[PDB]
């Protein structure tokens, strides 16, 4: 379907968009006490894999799944909350602020770099077709 | 006519590229409609069928809240690729017609 460069750069754009979405969702839920069921929000992470279609030669980036972080959930002593345990510590998400801003900046700069790569390739693509005519 | 048989493949490819271009632009235009499904066609299978259309739903990547499954990046890349392939088909068809012409000129 897609040309190889198109597929690689578009996969890069989609992967960076997914990472930015995960960062934004984490930054929104930084102060959430409960979900829809009664469990604390867990910071999400996105794992980049190389989609090496040929044997070890090249390939874009794919995202296998969005994993839930395994870090000590923040404990805040609020015994009056219905979600407090026997000891009374309500669970707050493990979303760090600085890491998510850094992730947003890095995802934006990778997105823009891949956009520039596509823009650069495009002129050569259109100029290839003048070879025959 | 034998002239049709020579130019049938490129004409059908060009028409299919134009139709898929229209479908992709419709997907772009209706990006903000809540509940709109992103539709597309499988170019190779439909080209087989015409040489010897049905719309297939695009697999959503991110779940939106309004039910819109149109992804900007994927369809922008597909739109650019379809434009490039339409230009390539125009080039090939023009080259074939120009060759058939210089065979006759004299």
């Amino acid at each position: 379907a897609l040309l190889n460069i198109f597929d690689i750069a578009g996969s890069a754009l989609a992967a960076q968009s997914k990472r930015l979405n995960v960062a934004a969702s984490n930054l929104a839920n930084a102060d959430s006490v409960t979900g829809p069921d009664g469990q604390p929000y867990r910071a999400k992470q996105v794992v980049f894999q190389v989609d090496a279609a040929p044997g070890q030669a090249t390939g874009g980036v794919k995202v296998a799944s969005v994993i839930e972080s395994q870090a000590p959930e923040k404990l805040v002593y609020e015994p009056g909350n219905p979600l407090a345990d026997a000891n009374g510590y309500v669970k707050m998400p493990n979303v760090d602020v600085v890491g998510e801003m850094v992730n947003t900046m890095s995802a934006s700069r990778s997105y823009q770099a891949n956009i520039e790569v596509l823009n650069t390739v495009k002129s050569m693509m259109l100029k290839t077709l003048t070879l025959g005519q | 006519d034998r002239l049709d048989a020579a130019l049938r493949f490129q004409q059908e490819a060009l028409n299919l590229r134009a139709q898929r271009q229209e479908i992709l632009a419709a997907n772009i235009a209706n990006a903000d409609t809540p509940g709109y499904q992103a539709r597309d066609i499988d170019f190779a299978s439909e080209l087989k069928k015409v040489m010897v259309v049905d719309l297939l739903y695009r697999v959503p990547d991110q779940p939106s809240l309004d039910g819109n499954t149109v992804d900007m990046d994927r369809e922008r890349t597909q739109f650019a690729d379809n434009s490039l392939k339409y230009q390539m088909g125009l080039t090939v068809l023009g080259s074939q017609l120009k060759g058939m012409m210089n065979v006759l000129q004299g």
């Binding site: 829809p36 794919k62 | 499904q37 739903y57 697999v59």
Partner: peptide, 21 residues
């Protein structure tokens, strides 16, 4: 399967409830 493939089935509606039903 892969995000961006072609299927003959529309995706299920995207519901996001606020409370558990």
């Amino acid at each position: 399967g892969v995000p961006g493939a072609l299927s003959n089935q529309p995706a299920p509606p995207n519901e996001a409830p606020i409370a558990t039903p």
